[PDB]
């Protein structure tokens, strides 16, 4: 029998490591359908900010215009979502981009030749030969010159090489950055990989002590199997460290004396980040999207 109090008693969270970019943690005693939904929303439904429309005024570089617009869209901006609202893609362009929807970035690079003494490196040989993502300038349009003055818009990875130039060439563009979800386009996906794996279970059946444990050590990652004696002979130290390579199954000494299963309700989530949000915060933002995804159906009239 199942309940919500019966789920609250058994559910556990064990947080392995937490960082500004990645976060490993466990979800114990939850179903695969729920944990796949958390993995799903983090890739596909948590919104983020990325450049959507690019307005080239001049581009005399080698890179095509539509190629260079594509590269700007893939640059992860460190804008916090919930500072922006959502655009409305039906009412036309004279009314659509407000200062509360949109963040304007600009790029204005010219390449000139550097007079140098010496087959030489082009940082010492041209001026502004490489264009990086840190050359994107935040232009605080409208009344949000004061709410983005606390922390302005910057790319989360400022050394992304966008274009390369030679003297005479220039790029002058202006990109509007809008809010969107990763199901629409992968540039809005706030996670570098939201994924899980299921906890490996290594069931030893017969005692395989002795030198038949020294070679049972080596069929697993190093921290996985331990040895003491014929007593506490060969046991699982950490069944979380194991990559399921099944290397012990191709030796005939152990094809009867071990199994490889999974612990089916114990998930090991590894959430990374593209940069805009910390990975513990887009797990909260995912578990609340699924909750509101059900409220909006509960609070909705059943039609016809």
């Amino acid at each position: 029998e199942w309940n919500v109090e019966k789920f609250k008693k058994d559910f556990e969270v064990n947080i392995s490591s937490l960082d500004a970019r990645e976060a490993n943690f466990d979800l114990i005693n939850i179903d695969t359908s729920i944990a796949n939904a958390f993995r799903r929303i983090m890739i596909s439904e948590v919104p983020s900010v990325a450049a959507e429309y690019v307005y080239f005024f001049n581009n005399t570089s080698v890179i095509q215009d539509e190629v260079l617009a594509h590269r700007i869209g893939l640059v992860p901006l460190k804008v916090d979502p919930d500072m922006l609202t959502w655009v409305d893609s039906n009412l036309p362009d004279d009314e659509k981009f407000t200062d509360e929807n949109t963040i304007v970035l600009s790029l204005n690079v010219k390449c000139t030749r550097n007079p140098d003494a010496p087959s030489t490196d082009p940082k010492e040989l041209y001026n502004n030969a490489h264009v990086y993502a840190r050359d994107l300038k935040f232009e605080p349009q409208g009344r949000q010159s004061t709410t983005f003055a606390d922390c302005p818009v910057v790319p989360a990875d400022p050394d992304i090489l966008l274009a390369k130039l030679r003297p005479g060439q220039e790029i002058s563009l202006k990109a509007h950055c809008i809010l969107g979800i990763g199901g629409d386009h992968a540039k809005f996906s706030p996670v570098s990989t939201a994924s899980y794996r299921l906890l490996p279970q290594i069931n030893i059946l017969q005692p395989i002590k002795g030198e038949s444990a020294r070679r049972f050590q080596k069929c697993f990652p190093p921290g996985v199997i331990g040895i003491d004696e014929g007593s506490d002979e060969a046991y699982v130290k950490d069944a979380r460290k194991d990559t399921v390579s099944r290397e012990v199954l191709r030796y005939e000494e152990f094809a009867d004396k071990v199994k490889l299963g999974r612990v089916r309700n114990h998930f090991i989530f590894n959430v990374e980040s593209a940069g805009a949000m910390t990975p513990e915060e887009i797990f909260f933002k995912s578990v609340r999207i699924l909750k509101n995804k059900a409220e909006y159906l509960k609070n909705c009239p059943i039609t016809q």
């Binding site: 990875d157 400022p158 050394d159 966008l162 996670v191 990989t193 990374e272």
Partner: peptide, 13 residues
Amino acid sequence: PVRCFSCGKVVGD
């Protein structure tokens, strides 16, 4: 490439 094709890590830096 700015991002990786499969994972989606920023690779261009």
